[PDB]
Design an enzyme around this catalytic site. Structure first.
Site, PDB file in Angstrom:
ATOM      1  N   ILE A  28      30.763   2.963  59.331  1.00 48.97           N
ATOM      2  CA  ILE A  28      30.875   4.141  60.174  1.00 48.97           C
ATOM      3  C   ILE A  28      32.262   4.224  60.831  1.00 48.97           C
ATOM      4  O   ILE A  28      32.777   3.223  61.323  1.00 48.97           O
ATOM      5  CB  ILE A  28      29.621   4.476  61.074  1.00 48.97           C
ATOM      6  N   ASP A 134      13.578   0.890  62.062  1.00 51.80           N
ATOM      7  CA  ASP A 134      14.694   0.017  62.398  1.00 51.80           C
ATOM      8  C   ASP A 134      15.104   0.195  63.859  1.00 51.80           C
ATOM      9  O   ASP A 134      16.296   0.253  64.170  1.00 51.80           O
ATOM     10  CB  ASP A 134      15.857   0.247  61.400  1.00 51.80           C
TER      11      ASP A 134
HETATM   12  N1  LIG Z   1      27.294   9.039  66.024  1.00 42.67           N
HETATM   13  C1  LIG Z   1      27.819   7.851  66.385  1.00 42.67           C
HETATM   14  N2  LIG Z   1      28.682   7.860  67.455  1.00 42.67           N
HETATM   15  C2  LIG Z   1      29.215   6.669  67.923  1.00 42.67           C
HETATM   16  N3  LIG Z   1      28.990   5.459  67.387  1.00 42.67           N
HETATM   17  C3  LIG Z   1      28.119   5.498  66.309  1.00 42.67           C
HETATM   18  C4  LIG Z   1      27.509   6.614  65.748  1.00 42.67           C
HETATM   19  N4  LIG Z   1      26.703   6.246  64.661  1.00 42.67           N
HETATM   20  C5  LIG Z   1      26.833   4.955  64.579  1.00 42.67           C
HETATM   21  N5  LIG Z   1      27.667   4.449  65.543  1.00 42.67           N
HETATM   22  C6  LIG Z   1      28.063   3.079  65.817  1.00 42.67           C
HETATM   23  O1  LIG Z   1      28.153   2.248  64.634  1.00 42.67           O
HETATM   24  C7  LIG Z   1      26.976   1.325  64.525  1.00 42.67           C
HETATM   25  C8  LIG Z   1      26.474   2.249  63.494  1.00 42.67           C
HETATM   26  O2  LIG Z   1      25.691   1.876  62.558  1.00 42.67           O
HETATM   27  P1  LIG Z   1      24.370   2.696  62.466  1.00 42.67           P
HETATM   28  O3  LIG Z   1      24.219   4.066  61.822  1.00 42.67           O
HETATM   29  O4  LIG Z   1      23.693   2.660  63.906  1.00 42.67           O
HETATM   30  O5  LIG Z   1      23.603   1.706  61.719  1.00 42.67           O
HETATM   31  P2  LIG Z   1      24.048   0.955  60.425  1.00 42.67           P
HETATM   32  O6  LIG Z   1      25.534   0.331  60.343  1.00 42.67           O
HETATM   33  O7  LIG Z   1      23.061  -0.342  60.704  1.00 42.67           O
HETATM   34  O8  LIG Z   1      23.548   1.724  59.098  1.00 42.67           O
HETATM   35  C9  LIG Z   1      26.153   1.589  65.839  1.00 42.67           C
HETATM   36  O9  LIG Z   1      25.484   0.440  66.393  1.00 42.67           O
HETATM   37  C10 LIG Z   1      27.114   2.334  66.782  1.00 42.67           C
HETATM   38  O10 LIG Z   1      27.949   1.410  67.569  1.00 42.67           O
END
Ligand SMILES: Nc1ncnc2c1ncn2[C@@H]1O[C@H](COP(=O)(O)OP(=O)(O)O)[C@@H](O)[C@H]1O
Length: 292
Positions: A28, A134
């Site tokens: 991300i 999750d």
């Molecule tokens: N819309 C968002 N805005 C800010 N930070 C985000 C966002 N989506 C994800 N993140 C950050 O990145 C990590 C994102 O991974 P996420 O989608 O939650 O799960 P994963 O990596 O386990 O598939 C989160 O714990 C958060 O810190």
């Protein structure tokens, strides 16, 4: 080596600024939206990953538009190298915010107020026919704007499963289901490879809240899924309530009695959080621990 380098531009619109998260299923990034001029979150998965979860993520995120505690859907696409989702950018996640606390604990005020918002998020996803599967602190993030900094957002729908069907009914559970989610927050039922239900997302919220108020879970150091499952099975769940508000017994008993087929009583759990706040003189307008 990141899937996308700094300054890479997706679909002539989203410019990668930096990597803000990752691990499971891909990465991300924080990106600049060249069309709207707003900073956004760009979630990507390699097209050569055996389990492709962005299709599920997109479907659930779209189904959730209009609900509170959910990122605004911005865009998505697919190509030979990667798949992607673009959504509203939020602030820091709850795992990061907890770890930054002096003793790795939140006050009861922060814990209970976060609990209410997470429960509302869980009820919102279940209301559109999906299980999250999750539920964990890192899948919840606070807003980053003056109008959103006290709002908590539910993230990561890649491991979601639709428990309803086209006719508005509940589909039969499979006789067995592969383990999904985190080891730390999974219910005993998830550990046993049972089909996950709405109550299993509420078990993950129960464990998160104990971890927030106490700072740790008994199985914190154990990584092995089976060893964790054995500890959770053996562990007298009432001992987790030693330092918890007394109405948490009602929350625990309700979820322990549920199965895949029974709709949870979300209001019973909400009442536990509300009474726990009132009995302590906790106001809903209070600053969160990290604001101080
Ligand atoms: N819309 C968002 N805005 C800010 N930070 C985000 C966002 N989506 C994800 N993140 C950050 O990145 C990590 C994102 O991974 P996420 O989608 O939650 O799960 P994963 O990596 O386990 O598939 C989160 O714990 C958060 O810190």
């Amino acid at each position: 080596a990141d899937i996308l380098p700094a300054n890479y531009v997706v679909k002539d619109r989203w410019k990668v600024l930096k990597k803000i998260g990752g691990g499971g299923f891909g990465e991300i990034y924080e990106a600049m939206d060249l069309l709207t001029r707003e900073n956004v979150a760009l979630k990507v998965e390699s097209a050569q990953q055996p389990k492709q979860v962005l299709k599920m993520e997109v479907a659930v995120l779209k189904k959730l538009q209009g609900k509170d505690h959910v990122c605004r859907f911005i865009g998505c696409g697919r190509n030979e190298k990667f798949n992607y989702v673009v959504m509203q950018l939020q602030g820091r996640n709850l795992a990061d915010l907890r770890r930054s606390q002096p003793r790795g604990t939140f006050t009861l005020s922060t814990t209970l107020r976060l609990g209410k918002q997470i429960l509302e998020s869980i009820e919102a996803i279940h209301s559109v026919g999906f299980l999250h599967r999750d539920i964990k602190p890192s899948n919840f993030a606070m807003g980053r704007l003056p109008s959103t900094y006290r709002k908590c957002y539910m993230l990561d729908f890649g491991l979601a499963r639709q428990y309803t069907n086209t006719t508005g009914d509940v589909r039969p559970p499979r006789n067995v289901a592969g383990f999904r989610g985190t080891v730390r927050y999974a219910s005993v039922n998830a550990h046993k490879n049972r089909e996950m239900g709405r109550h299993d997302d509420l078990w993950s919220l129960f464990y998160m809240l104990v971890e927030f108020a106490v700072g740790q879970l008994p199985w914190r150091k154990i990584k092995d899924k089976e060893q964790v499952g054995m500890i959770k099975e053996k562990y007298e769940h009432r001992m987790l309530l030693k330092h918890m508000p007394s109405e948490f017994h009602l929350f625990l008993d309700h979820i322990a009695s549920l199965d895949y087929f029974t709709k949870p009583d979300y209001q019973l759990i909400m009442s536990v959080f509300e009474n726990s706040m009132k009995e302590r003189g906790i106001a809903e307008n209070e600053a969160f621990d990290w604001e101080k």
